[model samples]
Target: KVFGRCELAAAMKRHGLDNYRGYSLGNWVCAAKFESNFNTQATNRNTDGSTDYGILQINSRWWCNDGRTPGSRNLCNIPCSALLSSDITASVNCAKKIVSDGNGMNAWVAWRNRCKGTDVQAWIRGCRL
Candidate 1:
């Protein structure tokens, strides 16, 4: 499922992402806009040869077990396929795990490029939630 920007914001906020790990919802909005464009089924293979899955693009190498990422830690203890579900509960949960792992939201390269050291308030402007 694909989400409108505000819809994605509201959904993510519902999952307690507004200021998770001190990263504002705007940061998340910016990251997701660039990472997957809010598409639940988005996936990308990285240059390091690991697959990234779902809206937040959780990586197979360290987060989910895809049975193919080789030295996967699978720290999130979830199948990579679970990241692609439209429900987004699993995806959001795994992201929380990644954040608390000490990397915080900086775990996402897209966030580093687009949201880091920037004001992302524009990303969530006019959103009801």
Candidate 2:
């Protein structure tokens, strides 16, 4: 399912991303926007042959196992396919793990460059959490 801006905001908030590890909801929203455009079916294959999946674009290399990445860590211990769906709960959980494991929000280069240190409040400006 593709989520509208406010829809994603509310869903992320409910999934426990609001101010998670000092990153605001907007930060997370911004990351998701750039990575997957809030589309759950999004997927990207990196130049190194690793694949990213779902709205958060959690990678098959380190986070989720796709059986395609050569050296997989599967740190999230989840099937990469689990992320390639409309339900975002799994991806949100993995996102928190990415943060909690000391990687911080910059684990996503997109977030580091685009969302980090920007006034991201407008990403969810009129959205009620």
Candidate 3:
């Protein structure tokens, strides 16, 4: 789904992600904006021979199985393609597991490199949700 910024924020809030699993909604929104532009179908080939999947950009290296990539921990135990679908509940659930695994927002390099410590509220600006 091509989510407008406010639409994305409202959806995240509806998912109970306003502060789901301890991370702030700002963190999630900002991270998603940079990682995939709130695009569920986004995928990127990484230089390390891993692929990043979906809005959260879950990686083939540690989180999900991409079939072609061997040695994946598959920590989420779901196919990486599952993250590529418009229904993001699976990816969101998986992301929660990732955060539980001690990475927090740091699980996403985009979050650490761009969203973290920034005025992430800008991601939700004018979104009344």
Candidate 4:
């Protein structure tokens, strides 16, 4: 795991993700919790044979390359494995890029499914950042 909730909040602040692309810190935090529990090493296989990578579970089919997915767009130009580590700089940057591409947090299913209408403040309730 790369962060506990507070640490994740601090890191997100440092990365300027508190309001990147108009998404709130709580929004990202909530999605991260649901998507990967703040685990940088987390991964999930999808029915399409694509995989979700890293904390935000960025899709291999579009954001990063996993080698298993043929004709992957790899819009972030990064190896999927790069996201599967404790260092989150690349992951954050890629996430910002994804949001910039007009997807917003909707790029992440976790955000839509678990965070969209929820009171996400509790996800960062005790964070000091």
Question: Which candidate tops TM-score?
Answer: 2
lDDT of 3 by residue, 1-129 (tens): 867888878877887787776777888889898999989999999887999999989989988999878777898999999998878788888888888786677888989999888888788888898
Tell how far residue 30 is off in model 1, in angstroms: 0.9
- Cα lDDT tens digits, model 4, 16-125, are 99888778889988888889998999999998899999998999989899899987789999999999879888889999998899778888888999899999788778
What are the RMSDs of all candidates, in order? 1.0, 0.9, 1.4, 1.1
lDDT of 3: 0.86
TM-scores, one per candidate:
0.95, 0.96, 0.91, 0.94
| lDDT for 88 (candidate 2) | 89
Off by over 4 Å in 3: none
Q: How many backbone clashes does candidate 3 have?
A: 0
Ranking by TM-score: 2, 1, 4, 3
Candidate 2 lDDT tens digits, 27-102: 9999999999999999999988999999999989899999999887999999999997778899998999999888
Off by over 4 Å in 2: none
Instruction: Assess each prediction's global lDDT (C-alpha) against the native.
Output: 0.91, 0.91, 0.86, 0.88
